[PDB]
């Protein structure tokens, strides 16, 4: 299976379908789709684990990618059996997800903690516990808890999309550190990111 805190599973959270592909709740998908293209990892149909997955070499490490196709609030119905099947401990998992509590263009690597009301993480933490790594992609907050659904299922204005895209591109450049188990250095260099 996995080996220490060498990241060997990278999960991107989001919703299936073209109507959700450009929404803020798919920030995790954006990051994983771009990572898969950067490293030539095929993301193929994975009906067994209710998602799209791939396996390939990142900087000399055997790494798996997963996009749940369960819809966001059932994400755990893909991530939990996939990670158990391949014997990947949470400490070797990175989950990329949209973060309401951070600005567009802010990105952070966090180890552990709660779901912060994220309905994808809410479906994962009760099964594998909190001790996986998260790539928190800032998307900002709409003000109301009543407005959160419409914000996360919205398509961000170009300025915010540009800020997110820059942050995601920065994070792609730091995955080499994560697959090598250099979580502290990755966390310092990801968290330091500034758009301008």
Q: Name the token pair of 146.
A: 């009543």
Q: In order of start, what are the domains of the chain with their CATH numbers? A: 1-196 (3.40.50.1470)
- Binding residue ranges for cytidine: 73, 119
Q: Which residue has the tokens 């995790």?
A: 28
Candidates 83, 40, 31; CA nearest to 59 is 40
- Binding residue ranges for tRNA: 20, 71, 73, 119
Residue of 25, 50, 97, 151 with catalytic role: 25
Contact between 109 and 187 under an 8 Å Cβ cutoff? The reply is yes
For residue 25, indicate whether it is catalytic: yes
Neighbour count for residue 157 (Cβ, 10 Å): 9
Q: How was this structure determined?
A: X-ray
- Binding residue ranges: 20, 71, 73, 119
The whole-angstrom separation of Cα 186 and Cα 81 is 27
Contact between 57 and 3 under an 8 Å Cβ cutoff? The reply is no
């Amino acid at each position: 299976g996995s080996h220490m805190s060498n990241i060997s599973l990278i999960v991107g959270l989001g919703n299936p379908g073209s109507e959700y592909a450009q929404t803020r709740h798919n920030a995790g998908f954006w990051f994983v789709e771009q990572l898969a293209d950067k490293y030539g990892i095929t993301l193929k149909n994975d009906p067994k684990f209710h998602g799209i997955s791939g396996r390939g070499n990142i900087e000399g490490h055997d790494v798996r990618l997963l996009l749940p196709m369960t819809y966001m609030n059932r994400s755990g119905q893909s991530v939990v059996p996939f990670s158990k099947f391949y014997q990947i401990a949470p400490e070797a998992i990175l989950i990329a997800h949209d973060e309401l509590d951070m600005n567009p263009g802010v990105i952070r690597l966090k180890t552990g903690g709660g779901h912060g009301g994220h309905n994808g993480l809410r479906d994962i933490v009760p099964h594998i516990g909190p001790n996986f790594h998260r790539l928190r992609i800032g998307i900002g907050h709409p003000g109301s808890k009543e407005r959160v659904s419409g914000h996360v299922l919205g398509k961000a204005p170009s300025n915010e999309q540009s800020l997110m895209d820059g942050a995601i591109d920065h994070a792609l450049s730091k995955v080499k550190l994560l697959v090598q188990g250099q979580v502290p250095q990755a966390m310092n260099q990801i968290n330091a990111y500034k758009p301008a």
